[model samples]
Target: MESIKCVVVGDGAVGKTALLIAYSSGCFPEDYVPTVFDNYNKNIPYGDGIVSIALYDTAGQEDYDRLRPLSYPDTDVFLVCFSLENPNSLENCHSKWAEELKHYNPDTPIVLVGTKLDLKKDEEYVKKLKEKKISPVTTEQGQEMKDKIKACGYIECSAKTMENLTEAFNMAIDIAMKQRLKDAPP
Candidate 1:
């Protein structure tokens, strides 16, 4: 059985664990840390082979500063998440983790996500703008971070309701497969 490692990074309270548990077990614990790094392993049941997926969840805040170095570790995919309701979380990720990951894992597949998908109608509207294909200047402050990320093709999702959650996992799997295929010796 082949395995792939993916790292989930974002600002504190950005719902990294919620997202992880949401995908793996379809459940999110009532209380979750806003910022912290955690590693998780799960077996993805597929037809012929069981695909192993490992995730390293990183703290979103600078307080847990040491966790950032793992960004360069042997990860096949990177998921950068931010909350639609928290502007600070969004900004911190752009200022801190964004460039670090780009510098360290340049070739690794990356998908940016705007979390809290089940917020409300107004929130959804703002999220959609953050997720638009061609980011506009008016929404620049909100658009800038997401745009820089979406340029790399980031998709927004909600862990609470599990909206677009499957896409997130599938995207990681697709990237992992592609990387392995390319890295295989011909």
Candidate 2:
């Protein structure tokens, strides 16, 4: 049986561990410490094979550089996560982790995730809230984000609510499998 190995990279507190927990255990969380090797295994049946997918969750710290490459260049898939409320986190993800991945596994399928979707929406709106000024998560921005990700052919997921979370990983893996088959070193 063949196994699949995927890695999750992002800024700490950007919801990497939360994404792992939700997909691995189907659980949600209010908080989480930065992860460093929180591994999960799933028994997936594929035709005559049982695919064991293992995910290596890292701390997302620059100091973890020593441990990062062990899984980086060798991974089959990558999930880069960022928080919706923290734009700096998103910038770091684009500048730091994504660059690192490109340096190593440039061809691996990537899924860009904007976690904390449940928090993105406001609980209540003021009576005077202007439609144009109203923050996104309620407007076309959500679709815009999805379209942006899809334009890169990447999936986006929300781990906190398990909203499109499972599909993110599954889609990346499926794409990787197809790509590998198509690009086999003839």
Best by lDDT: 1
TM-score of each: 0.75, 0.75
- Runs of candidate 2 with Cα error greater than 4 angstroms are 29-34, 45-50, 124-152
Residue 135 Cα positional deviation in candidate 2, in Å, after optimal superposition: 6.0
Whole-model Cα lDDT per candidate? 0.70, 0.67
- Candidate 2 weakest ten by summed lDDT: 125-134
Error of 1 at 35 (Å): 5.1
Across 1-186, the per-residue lDDT of candidate 2 in tens digits comes to 667887888888878887888877777755554456468787666556676778888778888877777877567777777776555666565568667777777677676667776556435432223343534233244335435433234544577668788877776567556666788887
